[PDB]
């Protein structure tokens, strides 16, 4: 308190403070900190994610109610509350919130996005022992391995199939090339041959890859990011066929997931292209449907990009042990996967014991044959940029805003 200070000394300090404050106000920071704007300090205090519970994000097309049921079982046994959410644009929101040390404890998505999350430091290395690993197929662990480390638990192996209305079309086409004539036939009955989501490149990729399109060349155990196959002859032939379908009025460039689903389930179109998650709504519909191998293009199989639905653990989570216990001992069991599967079908699961049951289902057999004909997606960090590039190319080529040659030239970097 009692200091040997004169008014002149205090005045000198007053002036220095005022010089500082004058600059601060001129910089428009009357209400903010200088050090914050310099990106100094932290963000944040390492405690945004609540300790002692689990928050889980999964896409809204998956069996999130069945997953929440597994969460309730977990809570009954352990007292740990599990909250399941399905935010829109989850795969964009997760990296944004997790970068700040926030977000869910566990994030579900196909494995392709996970290498980018891991490179950004957003995903924990997972630690299942060999005995647990032995319960899932080796190729599924491979999909979630990034630079030697396991960075997610694999859940299910997803591939697109051709889904068809057996009453309108007891005999589904073998080839993409048959579709225009089939559409002309069905149009005379007030129906169309085929509708599927043209807004997400996932759905058009199997045709683009058929005759030779590819994302990143894989050689000697590594992906060459300098060798991209989005604008080669095969990719062009595939996308040109799609564009010709639109030019010839066999499909509408505007068709999206809900337009195609509503039209197929109402019985207005004879075929759609979709994954196992979609089977539940068709089951509810009046449609008698089959699930079969995708049409060939130029005599070669369609090659869907295969996604392994996977559960990653937020690096910021203080609940990594709770998450491990939940995922290994509750979800990845016959009863856990059945709960999710009964809600929206997972397709072919990574867990050997449960996959052996489901394999009897002809819809799963067809999923697996389409998966086998395609390729497991890379998980490299360049995947997000690839998908954005191809999404743009397909939408622009389909709508006619650009030619196929120009759109694919733009996508190639
Ligand atoms: O369309 C690009 C998109 O494809 C894949 O997303 C799939 C996903 O794997 C399926 O689980 C399902 O939810 O439909 C999505 C397509 O709408 C990639 O996994 C994704 O990263 C990519 O953006």
């Amino acid at each position: 308190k009692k200091k040997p200070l004169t008014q002149e000394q205090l005045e000198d300090a007053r002036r220095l403070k005022a010089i500082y404050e004058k600059k601060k106000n001129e910089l428009g920071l009357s209400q903010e900190s200088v050090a914050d704007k310099m990106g100094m300090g932290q963000s944040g205090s390492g405690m945004k994610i609540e300790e002692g519970k689990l928050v889980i994000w999964i896409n809204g097309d998956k069996g999130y109610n069945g997953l929440a049921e597994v969460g309730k079982k977990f809570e009954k046994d352990t007292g740990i509350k599990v909250t399941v959410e399905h935010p829109d644009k989850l795969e964009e929101k997760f990296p944004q919130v997790a970068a700040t040390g926030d977000g869910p404890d566990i994030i579900f998505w196909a494995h392709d996005r996970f290498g980018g999350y891991a490179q950004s430091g957003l995903l924990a290395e997972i630690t299942p022992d060999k005995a647990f690993q032995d319960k899932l197929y080796p190729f599924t662990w491979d999909a979630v391995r990034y630079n030697g480390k396991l960075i997610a638990y694999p859940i299910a192996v997803e591939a697109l199939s051709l889904i068809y209305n057996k009453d309108l079309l007891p005999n589904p086409p073998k080839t993409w090339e048959e579709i225009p004539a089939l559409d002309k036939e069905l149009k005379a009955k007030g129906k169309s041959a085929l509708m599927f989501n043209l807004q997400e490149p996932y759905f058009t990729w199997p045709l683009i890859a058929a005759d030779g399109g590819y994302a990143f060349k894989y050689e000697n155990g590594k992906y060459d990011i300098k060798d991209v196959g989005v604008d080669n002859a095969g990719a062009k032939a595939g996308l040109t066929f799609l564009v010709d379908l639109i030019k010839n009025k066999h499909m509408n460039a505007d068709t999206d997931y809900s337009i195609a689903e509503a039209a197929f389930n109402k019985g207005e179109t004879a075929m759609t292209i979709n994954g196992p998650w979609a089977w539940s709504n068709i089951d509810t519909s009046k449609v008698n449907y089959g699930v079969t191998v995708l049409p060939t293009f130029k005599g070669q199989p369609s090659k869907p990009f295969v996604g392994v639905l996977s559960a990653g653990i937020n690096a910021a989570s203080p609940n990594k042990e709770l998450a491990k216990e939940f995922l290994e001992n509750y979800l990845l069991t016959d009863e856990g996967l059945e709960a999710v599967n009964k809600d929206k079908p997972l397709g072919a699961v990574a867990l050997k014991s449960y996959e052996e049951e489901l394999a009897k289902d002809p819809r799963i057999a067809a999923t697996m044959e389409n998966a086998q004909k395609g390729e497991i997606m890379p998980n490299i960090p360049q995947m997000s940029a690839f998908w954005y590039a191809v999404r743009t190319a397909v939408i622009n080529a389909a709508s006619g805003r650009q030619t196929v040659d120009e759109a694919l030239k733009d996508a190639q970097t």
Side-chain angles (χ1 to χ4, degrees), residues 59 61-62 91 109-110 112-113 158 197 200-203 277 307 309 377 387:
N59 206 46
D61 60 3
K62 303 311 185 311
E91 79 279 25
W109 193 263
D112 64 296
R113 299 240 164 206
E158 309 180 338
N197 184 7
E200 281 299 333
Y202 184 67
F203 297 85
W277 49 88
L309 174 67
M377 291 184 278
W387 279 127

Side-chain angles (χ1 to χ4, degrees), residues 256-298:
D256 61 14
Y257 192 97
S258 70
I259 292 173
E261 177 173 55
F264 186 81
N265 295 1
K266 208 160 309 182
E268 303 172 347
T269 187
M271 297 179 296
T272 189
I273 290 166
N274 221 325
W277 49 88
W279 300 342
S280 166
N281 292 344
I282 316 183
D283 280 346
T284 300
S285 82
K286 312 171 290 295
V287 180
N288 177 30
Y289 71 103
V291 178
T292 191
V293 179
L294 290 160
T296 62
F297 174 59
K298 297 172 74 173

